[PDB]
């Protein structure tokens, strides 16, 4: 019985993101996650998902969801992914 | 909403058709994309 809309702003609508080596993590809990409003906050170049359906998402529950915010170069966008290698994947941010 | 509606809009009823605000200045993700679905039915049916 929770009706507080989740603050999906302050991450996508944020003015300036954090550095790569200092990626910020925001704890998100005690809310109703409406992922439909994310598609209209900003254009999307890639919306890859791992293990979870990109569309069948508004009908699930989560213990804790952490949004990692960082800006990388355009040629290294393929590096942020589970199991990938590179400078960012080794010294800046590595996904399990 | 639960209140009945009419030919005009209301606080609890709106038009189901929304317009696309397609603008060439939008980045990748909001630009218009044409989709052509070529449905095929390949089977033992008489092919034309």
């Amino acid at each position, epitope marked *: 019985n929770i009706t507080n809309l989740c603050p999906f*702003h302050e991450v996508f*609508n944020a*003015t300036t993101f954090a550095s790569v080596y200092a990626w*910020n993590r925001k704890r998100i809990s005690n809310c109703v996650a409406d992922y439909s409003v994310i598609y209209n906050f900003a254009p999307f170049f890639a919306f890859k998902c791992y293990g979870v359906s990109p569309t069948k998402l508004n009908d699930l529950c989560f213990t804790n969801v952490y949004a990692d915010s960082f800006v990388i170069r355009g040629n290294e966008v393929s590096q942020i992914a589970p199991g990938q290698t590179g400078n960012i994947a080794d010294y800046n941010y590595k996904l399990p | 909403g639960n209140r009945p509606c009419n030919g005009v809009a209301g606080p609890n009823c709106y038009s189901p058709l929304q317009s696309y605000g397609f603008r*060439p*200045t939008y980045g990748v993700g909001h630009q218009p994309y044409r989709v052509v679905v070529l449905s095929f039915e390949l089977l033992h049916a008489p092919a034309t």
Partner: antibody
Amino acid sequence: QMQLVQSGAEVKKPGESLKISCKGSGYTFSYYWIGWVRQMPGKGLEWMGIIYPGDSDTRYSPSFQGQVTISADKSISTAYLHWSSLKASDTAMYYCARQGDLGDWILLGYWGQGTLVTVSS
Amino acid sequence: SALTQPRSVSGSLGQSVTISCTGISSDVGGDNYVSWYQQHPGKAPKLMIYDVSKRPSGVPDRFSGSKSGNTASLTISGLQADDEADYYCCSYALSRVVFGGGTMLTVLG
């Protein structure tokens, strides 16, 4: 030196849809976000929106999504303002602002001299 | 959120005074999205304080500030005749710049 001189003051009747412009110089008017700020006489500043010179991407405040439209001309480095259905309460001072290399893209670094818009019958 | 400021403040020449600024939001990347502008009567506002830990070029060093939760303050040392003007604090964390209700700085003489 960099200059952001705007157009002269104007006085029109409600419903004439006047146009205000601003001429910038001293910098590359292709990559710096430029916008306008509205201020009524005796009150605080009210930001309306901004525009990018390279591509006409516009970001409007929720209180100015349809009350005013912003356009720019990269070929002459001139921004423009246009209104529709001017009301009696729409008269206010309008200040322009640019991004600048001081802070972020949204931080207003430099300001113009201001253009007074008078609306009365 | 909307920024709130004291409408009228008082001071004196050669003394120090502080201007409060409340209602500042916070986004991912820090809470330093606070800026100040000074607008003389009949003139355009001038950027005096942005990235409060820093100051722009040409701005006198007598202006300074600090952050404390959701409330910011602007400190001025050595009030002079040219300091008698309006001041507006601005927040730009949510990709939207908002301004307070304005402040009126008066000094005795």
